Ligand binder design. Sequence first.
Ligand SMILES: OC[C@H]1O[C@H](O[C@H]2[C@H](O)[C@@H](O)[C@H](OCCCCCCC3CCCCC3)O[C@@H]2CO)[C@H](O)[C@@H](O)[C@@H]1O
Ligand SMILES: *C(=O)C1=CN=C(C(=O)O)CS[C@H]1c1cn2c(n1)COCC2
Length: 265
Amino acid sequence: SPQPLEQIKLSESQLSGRVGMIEMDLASGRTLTAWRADERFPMMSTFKVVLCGAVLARVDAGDEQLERKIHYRQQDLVDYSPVSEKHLADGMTVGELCAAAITMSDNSAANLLLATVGGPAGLTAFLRQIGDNVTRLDRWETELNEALPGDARDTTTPASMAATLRKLLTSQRLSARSQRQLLQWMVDDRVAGPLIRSVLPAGWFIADKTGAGERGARGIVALLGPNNKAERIVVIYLRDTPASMAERNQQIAGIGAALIEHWQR
Ligand SMILES: OC[C@H]1O[C@H](O[C@H]2[C@H](O)[C@@H](O)[C@H](OCCCCCCC3CCCCC3)O[C@@H]2CO)[C@H](O)[C@@H](O)[C@@H]1O
Ligand SMILES: *C(=O)C1=CN=C(C(=O)O)CS[C@H]1c1cn2c(n1)COCC2
């Protein structure tokens, strides 16, 4: 494989799109690789990790319980509700909703959770309170995936998303049990976790959340490392490419291969 930066460039040339990426040490925040790291990209479903960070902050403050059952109605459901559509009668706990949102990308679950944290404006205010001055959520599922050219709504930057994830997972803004919970939900991702493990060498850790949107938008927020350890945060976003989903996936995998082959930098 080429060096990671060279492989990112090659992926732009091949996709005829913009790629944004950060590779960051989880423990220290050292940035090892930046590429378009201050440019804006649609978050798509990757926002669900930050959402459940906000939920966990309310639990730590005594303002929420993961056990609290939320009842909802069929009229409330949006497209792709694989878990939530099964619990119209019996409801779901706040923690079950976060599991569904992060591990299955259940969109109704995400919207029910958004309603608990004050909507998109509430989530954006949470971000500002933990010192993320860039990321913004403006819409609900599924309209937030629209990825219009030039539109700043529902965007992050690779650098801001990585810093925000590190804050949630490691900075003691969240309680110890809450940090462990957030991590475990990412470990349990069903959408891409197993697929990623199928192509990772033995010994590599993965935890992740993925997203997709219009005009080729694609993204992943991940924890990765050798020796079965979550050593680095890797954030990769793609936008404005006509490529097939399979080719976008293959280019992100190729960046992954470059990082693995050149890990000690
Ligand atoms: O010498 C290093 C390794 O080189 C190869 O591993 C290959 C592997 O066979 C391939 O499947 C993967 O593709 C890349 C898989 C990565 C999937 C994307 C993951 C990313 C996306 C961004 C967020 C973090 C995770 O590349 C590695 C590195 O060449 C050998 O198969 C393996 O025995 C050896 O230990
Ligand atoms: C999250 O990224 C996300 C993106 N895109 C759409 C869409 O393209 O219509 C809908 S919401 C949400 C989503 C939908 N699914 C997943 N994530 C996971 O795969 C199954 C369907």
